[PDB]
Every structure is written in C-alpha cells, then in structure tokens.
Amino acid sequence: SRKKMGLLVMACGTPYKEEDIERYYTHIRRGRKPEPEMLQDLKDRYEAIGGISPLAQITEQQAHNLEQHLNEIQDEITFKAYIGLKHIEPFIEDAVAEMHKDGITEAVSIVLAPHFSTFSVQSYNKRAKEEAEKLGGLTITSVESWYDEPKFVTYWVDRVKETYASMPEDERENAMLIVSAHSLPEKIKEFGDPYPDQLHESAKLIAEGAGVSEYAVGWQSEGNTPDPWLGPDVQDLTRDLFEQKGYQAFVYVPVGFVADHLEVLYDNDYECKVVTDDIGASYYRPEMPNAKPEFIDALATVVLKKLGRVD
Ligand SMILES: *Cc1c(C)c(=O)n2c(=O)c(C)c(C)n12
Ligand SMILES: [Cl-]
Ligand SMILES: [Mg+2]
Ligand SMILES: [Mg+2]
Ligand SMILES: [Mg+2]
Ligand SMILES: [Mg+2]
Ligand SMILES: [Mg+2]
C-alpha cells in the first residue's frame, strides 16, 4: 500500500487560444486591458513563433511526465499531478481545491522556474498554502529553488558543450555565452531576495561544467511598470559586449525558463537574433528542457530530495 500524495506543479500559465490573449495579458497587467494595437501586435508575435496551442501543452506534458516518472522510479508514494497557474485558469487556488475535493491530504509542490524569488516562487507557495489552510485537512511542502540540482546543471552543461562543439573554429574561439532569466522589479532587493545571486550561480555552474571561460549574465522579458526592473536586458548586453570585445557568436542559455514559450521563442529567438544579425554575429540558443526525459528525471530527483527519500 503506497502513500498517496498530491504533486502541485505551478507556473505562470499561457493563453490556450488566440482569443485568450486579451484576458491573459489583462491579468498580467493587473486589470489594465491592452489597447487594440497591442492586442494585434501580440497576436502577430504568437503567429510568428508557430502559434499558441503548443504552449500550455508543454506545461501539461511536464506535469504528466513528472507524475509518471516519479511513480515508476520509487515504490513508496503514488503521486497525482495538479497544475496551478498564476495568470489563467486553472489557478493555484483551483488546483488546491481540486486536491482537497479528490481526497488528497498531503502534497508536495514545485514551481517550473528554478530560482527562488519573493515576487514569483514565494508568492505561489504562500498562495497554495493559504488555500490549503482555508480548506483544512491538507498540507503542502514546497520546493523553493532547484537551480543547483546537479542533474539540471548537467542538462544545460551538455547542451552548451554540444553547441560550442558544433561551431566553426573561429566562432568557438570568439564566442560569448549569455545566461539569463526573467527580469523582476529591482525592489526585490529590499527583501534580500536571492534571485539575482541564484541566476549568477547558475551561470557560474553551467559555464564551469561546459568549460566556457567567457560568459555574462543578463535578464529578459521585463514587464511594464514605473519602477526599474533587473538589468541589463539581454538585447543591450549583447550589443555592449560586441562593442567591447567583438564576439562573433552569442550563445543564449535562458536557464530561468523551462519551455518553448514566448519569452524564449520571441524574446530570444527573435529579439536577440535581431541584434546578432545587425552586428554580424551568429546566434545559438540550445534546446529548452521542455518535457524531455533528462529534465523530468532532474525534477523527480528535486522532489524526492525535498521529501528526504533520496540523499
Ligand atoms: C509568465 C512568466 C514566466 C514564465 C516567468 O518566469 N515569469 C516571471 O518571472 C514573471 C514576473 C512572469 C509574468 N512570468
Ligand atoms: Cl532558495
Ligand atoms: Mg479562433
Ligand atoms: Mg507517459
Ligand atoms: Mg536549496
Ligand atoms: Mg519585451
Ligand atoms: Mg522603467
């Protein structure tokens, strides 16, 4: 007889179809509906990246594959995955309510973003716990960060090694590795938020494992508020590094992101590519984890370590 546990997998969320762009972005913008020109622009961006339907499917596939893999690799717990999202249904509170309705009394949560922040991870975890407390009779232990899981570092190390090995000799000797995550408001620093330090440590670990001595850290995808967000932005960093040293290849590792969503397919593969094309450099951006077995095994290890069932 196995112990039953909920596996609460949390993420930003994505629209499910083009007609969800308005409500998704209204939610991100804290109730401010995008103007018509912006709605049209967003539609065009999603069309440019190959469409919307594949996006939420990745997150669902990650949760599904993680549940099945956890259930196969150990014999003590049977997990059932529930997805809880920030900016579109199913919302975090919906997922917790569904766990409670289904009879779950004990759950472990993980956010599909490897670095802790007060703005995102801590807020998701607190919301999940608050809903559990309101319903009663259900407890959640929450993963806070996992950027330093060795299997996750190794995923990116090996992707970087493959990219550098694929380069012509002249690029391989004159390339720059840019390691990035989603920008957040700079005011997180008032709380001692470790998010920037964790990104810098991811970059150090990945560059070290891959044997890449020239790398830099940047941020991407900042939102639209009056206070400053973490920088430099990858677009500006790329140009600055080019002006300083003349790199002829840029390799983008958006380690803060786990899937082929707009922030990678457009904010790297279009916006950074515009800059590398303008300066005459080659652009590389290795495969995101998505739902691939190597990444799912890394997440399974994160979960079982959090529960103390793996050293
Ligand atoms: C939607 C989204 C993703 C994937 C992410 O990592 N983040 C953030 O950090 C914010 C603030 C938002 C929105 N998102
Ligand atoms: Cl942490
Ligand atoms: Mg339609
Ligand atoms: Mg399966
Ligand atoms: Mg830790
Ligand atoms: Mg942008
Ligand atoms: Mg500003």
UniProtKB/Swiss-Prot annotation:
Ways its activity is controlled: Stimulated by Mg(2+). Inhibited by Cd(2+). Inhibited by N-methylmesoporphyrin (N-MeMP) and 2,4-disulfonic acid deuteroporphyrin IX (dSDP).
UniProt-reported outcome of changing E263Q: Retains 21% of activity
Keyword vocabulary terms for this entry: Cytoplasm, Heme biosynthesis, Iron, Lyase, Magnesium, Metal-binding, Porphyrin biosynthesis
Gene Ontology BP, a term: heme biosynthetic process
Pathway the protein contributes to: Porphyrin-containing compound metabolism; protoheme biosynthesis
Binding, Fe-coproporphyrin III: C12, R29, R45, Y46, S53, Y124
Residues involved in Fe(2+) binding: H182, E263
Keyword Cytoplasm: yes
EC number: 4.99.1.9
Residues the entry annotates as binding N-methylmesoporphyrin: C12, R30, G31, R32, H182, K187
Domain of life: Bacteria
Variation of activity with pH: Optimum pH is 7.2 with Zn(2+) and protoporphyrin IX as substrates.
Catalytic activity: Fe-coproporphyrin III + 2 H(+) = coproporphyrin III + Fe(2+)
Compartment(s): Cytoplasm
Outcome of substituting E263V: Retains less than 1% of activity
PROSITE patterns associated with the record: FERROCHELATASE (PS00534)
Catalytic class of the enzyme: lyase
Quaternary context: Monomer. Interacts with frataxin/Fra.
The protein's role, per its UniProt record: Involved in coproporphyrin-dependent heme b biosynthesis. Catalyzes the insertion of ferrous iron into coproporphyrin III to form Fe-coproporphyrin III. It can also insert iron into protoporphyrin IX. Has weaker activity with 2,4 disulfonate, deuteroporphyrin and 2,4 hydroxyethyl. In vitro, can also use Zn(2+) or Cu(2+).
Name of protein: Coproporphyrin III ferrochelatase
Species for this entry: Bacillus subtilis (strain 168)
